[PDB]
PDB file of C-alpha atoms in Angstrom:
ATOM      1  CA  UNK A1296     -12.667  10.122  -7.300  1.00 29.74           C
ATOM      2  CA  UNK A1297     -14.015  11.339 -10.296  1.00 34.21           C
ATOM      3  CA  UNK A1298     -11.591   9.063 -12.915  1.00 34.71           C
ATOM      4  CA  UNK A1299     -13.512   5.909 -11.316  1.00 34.82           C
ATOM      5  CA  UNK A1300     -16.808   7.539 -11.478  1.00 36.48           C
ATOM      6  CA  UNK A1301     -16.611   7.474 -15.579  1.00 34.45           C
ATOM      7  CA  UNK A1302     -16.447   3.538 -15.278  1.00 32.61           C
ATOM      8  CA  UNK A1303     -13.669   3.317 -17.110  1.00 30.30           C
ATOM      9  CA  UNK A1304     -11.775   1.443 -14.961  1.00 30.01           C
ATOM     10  CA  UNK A1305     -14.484  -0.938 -14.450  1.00 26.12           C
ATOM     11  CA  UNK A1306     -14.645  -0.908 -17.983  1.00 24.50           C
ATOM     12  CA  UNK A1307     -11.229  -2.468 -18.436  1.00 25.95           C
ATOM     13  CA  UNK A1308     -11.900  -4.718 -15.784  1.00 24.18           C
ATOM     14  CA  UNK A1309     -14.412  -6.311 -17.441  1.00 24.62           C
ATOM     15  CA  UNK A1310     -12.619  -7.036 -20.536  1.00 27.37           C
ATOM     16  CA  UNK A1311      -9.585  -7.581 -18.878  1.00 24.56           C
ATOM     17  CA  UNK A1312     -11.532 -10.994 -17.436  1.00 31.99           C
ATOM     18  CA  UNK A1313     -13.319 -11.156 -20.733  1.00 29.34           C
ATOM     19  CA  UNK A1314      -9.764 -11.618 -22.494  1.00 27.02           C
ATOM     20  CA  UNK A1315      -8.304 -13.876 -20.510  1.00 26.04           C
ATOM     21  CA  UNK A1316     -11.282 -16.462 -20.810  1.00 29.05           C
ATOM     22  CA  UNK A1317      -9.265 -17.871 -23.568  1.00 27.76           C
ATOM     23  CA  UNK A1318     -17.688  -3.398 -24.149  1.00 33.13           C
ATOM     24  CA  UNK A1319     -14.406  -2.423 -26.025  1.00 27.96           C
ATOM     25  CA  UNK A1320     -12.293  -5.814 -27.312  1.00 29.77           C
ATOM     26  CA  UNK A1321      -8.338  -6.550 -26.230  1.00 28.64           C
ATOM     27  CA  UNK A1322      -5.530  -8.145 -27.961  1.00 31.34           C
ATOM     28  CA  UNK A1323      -2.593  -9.757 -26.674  1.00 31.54           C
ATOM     29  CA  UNK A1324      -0.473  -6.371 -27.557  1.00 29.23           C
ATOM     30  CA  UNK A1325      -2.716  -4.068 -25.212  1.00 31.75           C
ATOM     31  CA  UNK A1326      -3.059  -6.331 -22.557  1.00 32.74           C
ATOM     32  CA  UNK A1327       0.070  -5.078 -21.070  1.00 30.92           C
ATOM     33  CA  UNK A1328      -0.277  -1.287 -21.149  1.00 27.51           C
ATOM     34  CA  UNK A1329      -3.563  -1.592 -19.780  1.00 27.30           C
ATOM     35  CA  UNK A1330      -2.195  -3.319 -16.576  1.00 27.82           C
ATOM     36  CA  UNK A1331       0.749  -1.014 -15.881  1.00 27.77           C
ATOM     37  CA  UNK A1332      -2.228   1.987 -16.359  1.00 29.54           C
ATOM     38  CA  UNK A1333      -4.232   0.053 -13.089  1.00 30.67           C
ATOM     39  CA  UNK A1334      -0.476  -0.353 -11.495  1.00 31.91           C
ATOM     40  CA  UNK A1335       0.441   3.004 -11.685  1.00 32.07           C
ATOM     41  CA  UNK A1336      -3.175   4.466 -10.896  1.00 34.51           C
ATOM     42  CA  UNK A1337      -2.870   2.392  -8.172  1.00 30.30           C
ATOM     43  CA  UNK A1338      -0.287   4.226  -6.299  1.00 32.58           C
ATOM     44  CA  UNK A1339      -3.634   6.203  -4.501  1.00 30.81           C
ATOM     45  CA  UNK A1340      -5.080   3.974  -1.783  1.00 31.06           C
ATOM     46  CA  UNK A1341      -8.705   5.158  -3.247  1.00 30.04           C
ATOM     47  CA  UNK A1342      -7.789   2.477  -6.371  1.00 33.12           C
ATOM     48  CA  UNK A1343      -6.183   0.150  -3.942  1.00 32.20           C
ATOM     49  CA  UNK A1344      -9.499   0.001  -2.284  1.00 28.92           C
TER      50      UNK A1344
ATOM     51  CA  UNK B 846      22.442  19.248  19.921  1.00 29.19           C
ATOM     52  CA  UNK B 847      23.404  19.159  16.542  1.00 26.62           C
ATOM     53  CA  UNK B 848      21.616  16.149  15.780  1.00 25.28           C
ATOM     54  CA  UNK B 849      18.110  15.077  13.486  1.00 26.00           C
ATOM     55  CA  UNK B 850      14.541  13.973  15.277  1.00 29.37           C
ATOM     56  CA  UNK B 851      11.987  12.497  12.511  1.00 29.50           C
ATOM     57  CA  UNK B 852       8.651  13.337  13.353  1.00 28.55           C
ATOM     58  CA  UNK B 853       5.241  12.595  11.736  1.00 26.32           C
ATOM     59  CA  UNK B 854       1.893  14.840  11.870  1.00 26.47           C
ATOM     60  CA  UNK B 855      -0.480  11.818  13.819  1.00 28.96           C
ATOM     61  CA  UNK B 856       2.254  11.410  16.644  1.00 26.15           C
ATOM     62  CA  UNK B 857       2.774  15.193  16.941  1.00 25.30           C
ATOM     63  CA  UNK B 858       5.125  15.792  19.531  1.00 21.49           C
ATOM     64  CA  UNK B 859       6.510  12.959  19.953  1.00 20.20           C
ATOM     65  CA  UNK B 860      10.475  12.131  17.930  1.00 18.79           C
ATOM     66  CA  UNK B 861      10.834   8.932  16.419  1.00 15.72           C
ATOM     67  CA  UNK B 862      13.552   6.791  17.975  1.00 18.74           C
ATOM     68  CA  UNK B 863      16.441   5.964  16.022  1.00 19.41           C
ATOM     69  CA  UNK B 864      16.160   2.124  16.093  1.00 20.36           C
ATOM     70  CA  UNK B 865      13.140   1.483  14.785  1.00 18.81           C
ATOM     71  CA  UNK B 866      12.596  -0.189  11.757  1.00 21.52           C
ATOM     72  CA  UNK B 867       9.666   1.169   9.330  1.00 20.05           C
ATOM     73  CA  UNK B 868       7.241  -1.865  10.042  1.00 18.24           C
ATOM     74  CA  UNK B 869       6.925  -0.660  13.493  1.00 18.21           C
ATOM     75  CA  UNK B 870       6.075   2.886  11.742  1.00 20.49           C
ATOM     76  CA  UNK B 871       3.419   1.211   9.764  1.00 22.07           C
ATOM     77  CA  UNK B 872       1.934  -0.439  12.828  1.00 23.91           C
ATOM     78  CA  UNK B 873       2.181   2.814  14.768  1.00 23.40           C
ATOM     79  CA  UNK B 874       0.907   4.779  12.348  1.00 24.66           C
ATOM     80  CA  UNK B 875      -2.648   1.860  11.426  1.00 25.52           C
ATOM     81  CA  UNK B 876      -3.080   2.162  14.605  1.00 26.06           C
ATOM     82  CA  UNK B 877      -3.668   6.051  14.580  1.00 25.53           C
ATOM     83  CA  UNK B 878      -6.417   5.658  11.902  1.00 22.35           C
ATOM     84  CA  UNK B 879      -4.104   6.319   8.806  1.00 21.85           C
ATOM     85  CA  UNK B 880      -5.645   5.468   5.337  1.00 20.91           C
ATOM     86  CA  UNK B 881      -4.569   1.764   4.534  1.00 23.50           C
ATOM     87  CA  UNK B 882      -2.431   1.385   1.901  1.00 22.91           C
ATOM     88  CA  UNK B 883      -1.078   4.806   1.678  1.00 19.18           C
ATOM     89  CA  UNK B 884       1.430   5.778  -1.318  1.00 19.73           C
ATOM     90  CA  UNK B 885       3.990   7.284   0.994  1.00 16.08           C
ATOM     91  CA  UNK B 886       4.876   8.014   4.589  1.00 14.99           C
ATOM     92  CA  UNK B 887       5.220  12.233   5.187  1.00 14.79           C
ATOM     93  CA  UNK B 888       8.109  12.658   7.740  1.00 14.28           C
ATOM     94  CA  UNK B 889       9.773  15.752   8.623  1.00 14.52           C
ATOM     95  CA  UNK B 890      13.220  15.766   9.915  1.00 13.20           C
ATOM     96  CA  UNK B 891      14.293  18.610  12.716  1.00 15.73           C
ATOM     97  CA  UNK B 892      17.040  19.596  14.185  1.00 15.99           C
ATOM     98  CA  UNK B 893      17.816  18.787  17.791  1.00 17.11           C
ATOM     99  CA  UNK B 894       9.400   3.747  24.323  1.00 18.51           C
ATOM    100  CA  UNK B 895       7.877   2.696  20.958  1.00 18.36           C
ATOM    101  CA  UNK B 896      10.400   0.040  19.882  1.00 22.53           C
ATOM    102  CA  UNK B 897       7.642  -2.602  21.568  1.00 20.94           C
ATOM    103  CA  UNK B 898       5.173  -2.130  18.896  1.00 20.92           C
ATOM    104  CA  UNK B 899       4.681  -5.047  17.046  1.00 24.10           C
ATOM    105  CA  UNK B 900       5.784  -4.961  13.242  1.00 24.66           C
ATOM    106  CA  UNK B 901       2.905  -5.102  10.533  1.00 24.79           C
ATOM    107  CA  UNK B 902       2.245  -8.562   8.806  1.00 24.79           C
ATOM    108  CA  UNK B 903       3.945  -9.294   5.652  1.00 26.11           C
ATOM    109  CA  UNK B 904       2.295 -11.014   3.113  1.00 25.68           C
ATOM    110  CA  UNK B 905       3.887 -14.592   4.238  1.00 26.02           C
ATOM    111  CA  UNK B 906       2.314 -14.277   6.980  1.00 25.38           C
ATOM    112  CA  UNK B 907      -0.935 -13.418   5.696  1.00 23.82           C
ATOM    113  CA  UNK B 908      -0.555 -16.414   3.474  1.00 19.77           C
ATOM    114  CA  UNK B 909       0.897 -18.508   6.589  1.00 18.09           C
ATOM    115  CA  UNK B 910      -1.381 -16.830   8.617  1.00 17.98           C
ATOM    116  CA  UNK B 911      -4.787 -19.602   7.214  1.00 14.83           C
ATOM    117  CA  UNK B 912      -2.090 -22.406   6.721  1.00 15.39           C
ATOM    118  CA  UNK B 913      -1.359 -21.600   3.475  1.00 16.77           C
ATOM    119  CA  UNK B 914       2.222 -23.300   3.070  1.00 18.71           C
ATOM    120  CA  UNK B 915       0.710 -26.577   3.819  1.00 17.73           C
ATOM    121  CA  UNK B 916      -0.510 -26.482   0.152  1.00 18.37           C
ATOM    122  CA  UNK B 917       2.910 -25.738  -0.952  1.00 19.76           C
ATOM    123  CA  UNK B 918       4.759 -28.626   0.289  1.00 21.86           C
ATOM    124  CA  UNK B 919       1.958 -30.800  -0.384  1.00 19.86           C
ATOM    125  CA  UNK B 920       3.297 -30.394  -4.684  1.00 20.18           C
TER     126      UNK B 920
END
């Protein structure tokens, strides 16, 4: 409850949509890690909401 | 009898039967106002009809379900 409530994930999300249209910048070599860290916070159905 | 009954904690007091498969469980389960998209599914195994319900839509369908694979074949 509290881990979304720091924005963090909607902090990633952002630049997750900012990288791909090709704030804290991404390369091509953390794009990865950062998506398996939403997949496997994901398990709870509070993130899948 | 020496034999196991699954059980879950919404449908208290009542065993699972043998033959059904686990989207039946899902449905059964939605339909007793479980959280959506839960991680896992908490049975509890004991020592010793529902087979109607409906099993939950898979994603084809979903996608089927607003005529989605008439896209598909169209390229």
């Amino acid at each position: 409850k509290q881990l979304l409530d720091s924005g963090l994930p909607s902090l990633l999300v952002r630049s997750l949509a900012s990288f791909c249209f090709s704030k804290m910048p991404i390369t091509a070599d953390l794009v990865a890690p950062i998506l398996r860290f939403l997949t496997e916070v994901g398990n709870s159905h509070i993130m899948k909401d | 009898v020496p034999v196991f009954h699954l059980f879950h904690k919404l449908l208290a007091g009542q065993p699972l039967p043998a033959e059904m498969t686990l989207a039946q469980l899902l449905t059964l389960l939605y339909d007793r106002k479980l959280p959506q998209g839960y991680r896992s599914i908490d049975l509890t195994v004991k020592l010793g009809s529902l087979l109607e319900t409906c099993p939950i839509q898979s994603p084809l369908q979903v996608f089927a379900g607003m005529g989605g694979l008439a896209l598909i074949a169209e390229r």
